[PDB]
Amino acid sequence: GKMFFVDLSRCTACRGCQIACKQWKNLPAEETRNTGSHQNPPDLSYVTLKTVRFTEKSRKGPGIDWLFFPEQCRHCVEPPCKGQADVDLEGAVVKDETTGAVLFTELTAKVDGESVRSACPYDIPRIDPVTKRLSKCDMCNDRVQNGLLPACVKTCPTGTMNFGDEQEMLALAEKRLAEVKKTYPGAVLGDPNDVRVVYLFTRDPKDFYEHAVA
Amino acid sequence: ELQKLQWAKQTTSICCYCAVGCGLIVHTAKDGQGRAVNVEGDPDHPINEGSLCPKGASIFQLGENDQRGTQPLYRAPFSDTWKPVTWDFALTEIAKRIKKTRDASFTEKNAAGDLVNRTEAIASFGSAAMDNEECWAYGNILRSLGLVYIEHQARIXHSPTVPALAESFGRGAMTNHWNDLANSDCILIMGSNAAENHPIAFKWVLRAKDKGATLIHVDPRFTRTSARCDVYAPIRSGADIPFLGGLIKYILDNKLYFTDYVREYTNASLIVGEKFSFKDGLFSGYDAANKKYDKSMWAFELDANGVPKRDPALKHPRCVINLLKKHYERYNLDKVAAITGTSKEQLQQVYKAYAATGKPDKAGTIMYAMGWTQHSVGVQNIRAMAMIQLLLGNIGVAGGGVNALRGESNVQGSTDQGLLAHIWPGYNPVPNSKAATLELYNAATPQSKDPMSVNWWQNRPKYVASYLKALYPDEEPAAAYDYLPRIDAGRKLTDYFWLNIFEKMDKGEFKGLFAWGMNPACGGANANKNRKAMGKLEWLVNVNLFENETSSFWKGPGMNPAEIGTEVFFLPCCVSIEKEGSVANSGRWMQWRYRGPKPYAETKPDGDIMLDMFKKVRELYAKEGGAYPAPIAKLNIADWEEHNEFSPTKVAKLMNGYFLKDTEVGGKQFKKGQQVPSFAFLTADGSTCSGNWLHAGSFTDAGNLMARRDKTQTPEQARIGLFPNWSFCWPVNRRILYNRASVDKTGKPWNPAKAVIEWKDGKWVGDVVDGGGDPGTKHPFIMQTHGFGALYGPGREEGPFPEHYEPLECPVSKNPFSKQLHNPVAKAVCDPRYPFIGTTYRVTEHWQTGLMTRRCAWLVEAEPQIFCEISKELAKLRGIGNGDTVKVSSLRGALEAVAIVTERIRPFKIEGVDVHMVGLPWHYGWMVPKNGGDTANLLTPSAGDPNTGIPETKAFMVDVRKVW
Ligand SMILES: Nc1nc2c(c(=O)[nH]1)N[C@H]1C(S)=C(S)[C@@H](COP(=O)(O)OP(=O)(O)OC[C@H]3O[C@@H](n4cnc5c(=O)[nH]c(N)nc54)[C@H](O)[C@@H]3O)O[C@H]1N2
Ligand SMILES: Nc1nc2c(c(=O)[nH]1)N[C@H]1C(S)=C(S)[C@@H](COP(=O)(O)OP(=O)(O)OC[C@H]3O[C@@H](n4cnc5c(=O)[nH]c(N)nc54)[C@H](O)[C@@H]3O)O[C@H]1N2
Ligand code: SF4
Ligand code: SF4
Ligand code: SF4
Ligand code: SF4
Ligand SMILES: [S]
Ligand SMILES: [W+6]
């Protein structure tokens, strides 16, 4: 199986990943407006599989702690979205044996979309108001099967985004956590045993986003 | 197989946005015979390794964009609509407007009776966005037509760097390169927001941190850069020289300078003449009438042979080093902390971290861009950085340098090709009216009598002659010299620059303007004035990707098309990935890129547009005659084309240069037609041509070195990441400039673990040595007259040492360092109705005026509207909530924006009073998108200064009010 390691201690919020995801799949842009934040789109949607969340936290001295969170499906080892949906119809949500990708299919139009979102501990699935299909991050599974990095990983300039075989990436996450703690002592890995997208947070994960961790 | 990329042809390209120079891979349908289907990063490129920021990553949406121009448009006087027209009509009628204006305006001799052979009724803006071969051909077209008002982007962001660093080191360029940042032990980012504005640079900055480096950001605002640095130090607007002067004092007081480096490789030991002095904020030789210095008062004491005297013991009181100590003793931590608003504790931390790189085996680098230098002392800011780097021995070494970050993908190149009013290609000055002959021109170059001083600029006659042979190969250089226009020696140089072109335009003194690859209706300070001023043109040519606020100024806000008589031609050019050519990145890497998809609809490359346009002028002159036809008719354009179109390859070969006959040079035989292998083999006797001497070496008989994609490195090359077989950098593939300073006088590196060059058994190993010669036999700064890195720099208008002169006018009345408040060699109103300091800056997702990126849905998606960033303090004072609509106003204009209330902005304490800063992006404009907002340059002033000619876009007075 494959895995992402996302070292949020290196993120510049360039939003290369957000754009590259849409370029590869030729996704449409949403209608957005500025409501007092650089964050946009404000949320994941049927047409937005990844958005970078921005959070400002006061600190003592000059400046802030500026927290950035490029959100995506965690590609859970034991996916609750699939456990749901398999109630209505098997084949709506499948798991790739080789990569470990969790994949939504066209049959998601036939299941209870709203229910499948609720089952997700990370609040990831989004519904098309018209066709009722569910969408989310698909791990760029076709790229991965063809020996390419996922679009968001390849584009990333800082080394925030990492991808590879699960043992290499777990070994990398443990090694990096130790190094990162020398600068950020309260650094933690997010649900490292449950998921295939392992975020390193510089502090309390919920500071980055309320569903940062399960 | 991936279906999306199956059946598509794969070509390489280079990003069309910033000067990092990231590599792309382009997939084009029908095995190259259709449209682009995908654009992403080139995994093999050594700078980005496949990475792209959102601008680069969205180039597919830029190129395959249905809002792009499809064909020429024409707008008749007083009309209120565009009329589509053929290329034939457009280029024909433009050639006639050029000829009609030239014939009526041309002046062979000025009033004083000197030959000038020019027209002053036409001006040109642009552009750093064109390929290097296009920039070169464009400048030579404009000058063959007799123009002198030739400017582009470089005036604003590049032009301060060139004399600051030239004075200091002998060249104006960024000293190191992007990959080299990874070798630094301490990175000081000051006057730069590199994480947002040069994003792939942070790949290498963070790798420096991984190996133990300290990252420091010094900025008035907390940015996405600041978020990833070890130390964020706030600084008050315009307080940079106090900051840097305190660091110089700290270095001297604590003896953290690199003693051997300073003694041997800087001008520390040189004896300054007794006529030098400084008192109460004024140097000696001040003329209070003319607001100017007599700089001969700053001259060195010369020995019997005309060489500046030296005390290697550094004990003589008039040694540069002793005068330096004296000058900066006023910059104590207490005074500096008060004015900068940086706490003493943080100053000490920053000074300690950075001055530690004064160790021989530690390296510190400074990264700056345009942010901090938009005023009259910007040159002296950069001088201070250079001086610090020289004291610490950081110039010439891996992980060191002054990394003056270039803005646009080819601003280095566009400047290199002389698209500013004062320079020809290769930084040969444009002659003034008193340089009556070529011999007089060549007479101005200073000579050295020091045998250890290479003084390379003595070769200038070879370069000027070779240039003239490139344009006019059937003429003797001395004769060809008379074809090209000359500026008036009487006038101040700034009369020919950006800001004054707008001033003259407003007085109705221009007939025609080229707006070639620029959007001045948004990019020029004081937009309301410029928009009105453009209505006093007779014709306007806009060459551009899309319709924009410049092309269509005549139907802009408040404008009545029926009252505006300007005739406008819009010519749609093609995007970067639809053409072949080179771009020179910030580190001087000259990188070749290839055509992927064919031009969209009936768009053309700039090379074809300009060449076709010139040919029509050439035809008109051949059949009608007219004003002094010779410069046009004799210009060598046959070297510029192949198979009936502009040829990037052939122009590049001409720019490199070739022998016009069998020639012996430097004890080598050369046959006629051979490519010149380096600028060392150029001649002044007509044997050689070369369009740009800097390019000599880039395209030899061995082929196009700019197109090399070879990652082969020796161990010592790979350790610091020189990549010498990847593309080509001027000069002659020297990746790190001044590298002779990186070794002792036996040729042993100061830091063996990060060697740049090394003397290994008879030769230099590593980088290409910057100046030939055995160890210990040459001074290391070969482009300097005297050979030394200049701590003391007496060629600068403001004085030989940087000194704090307040660039903020309105909130300040006293200078704590002297009795001289403002720059004494340089009319702000300060109307009390505008109490806040407005500033403009960039975000990661948009480009320049936003002309390009406001057309890309994914970038608008992330940043859809103009905003105004303010502190919680100012929000409370004005009763503004996060996300409210606010009105920002000044003496010059007004606009609306969305408020962003953030702790990332804080008040400044200036002379006991809280002063609030107000931040705007300058990426917006009325044409597109819906509800985006208009340019922040509605608010900015256009009163520059007679030295720089730069408007103040970083500190200008505004008010902010809530709207409902
Ligand atoms: N995303 C993006 N990148 C770009 C561009 C773009 O439009 N968008 N444009 C490119 C071009 S053409 C250029 S010239 C470069 C310019 O690149 P930068 O110079 O980095 O650009 P800015 O954001 O205008 O200014 C940089 C910083 O200077 C700070 N600053 C303002 N006043 C002062 C001062 O008095 N002192 C100090 N120390 N800092 C101060 C601002 O707060 C800001 O954070 O960027 C290039 N790269
Ligand atoms: N208030 C304020 N004003 C500023 C600045 C600031 O910081 N604040 N920054 C200043 C600086 S440093 C700069 S660089 C200027 C920039 O000002 P401009 O250069 O006028 O800005 P844009 O036109 O947005 O720059 C991109 C242009 O490149 C064109 N282009 C792209 N590719 C090609 C091509 O192949 N051929 C041709 N012919 N055109 C092409 C696009 O059509 C577009 O017009 O703005 C300056 N003005
Ligand atoms: S591309 Fe990398 S650095 Fe940029 S926002 Fe995404 S994860 Fe962060
Ligand atoms: S994060 Fe949610 S949508 Fe993604 S696999 Fe897990 S349960 Fe399913
Ligand atoms: S892995 Fe692919 S689908 Fe998932 S966020 Fe990244 S680019 Fe988008
Ligand atoms: S804009 Fe600059 S950093 Fe971003 S992809 Fe292009 S060259 Fe690289
Ligand atoms: S630029
Ligand atoms: W610029």
Residue numbers in the entry:
A (entry chain B): 2 to 215
B (entry chain A): 36 to 861, 869 to 1006
Reported in the publication:
This work presents a combined biochemical, spectroscopic, and structural characterization of Desulfovibrio vulgaris FdhAB (DvFdhAB) when exposed to oxygen in the presence of a substrate (formate or CO2).
Thus, in the current work, the non-activated enzyme (C845–C872 disulfide bond oxidized) was used to slow down the catalytic reaction, aiming at trapping putative intermediates.
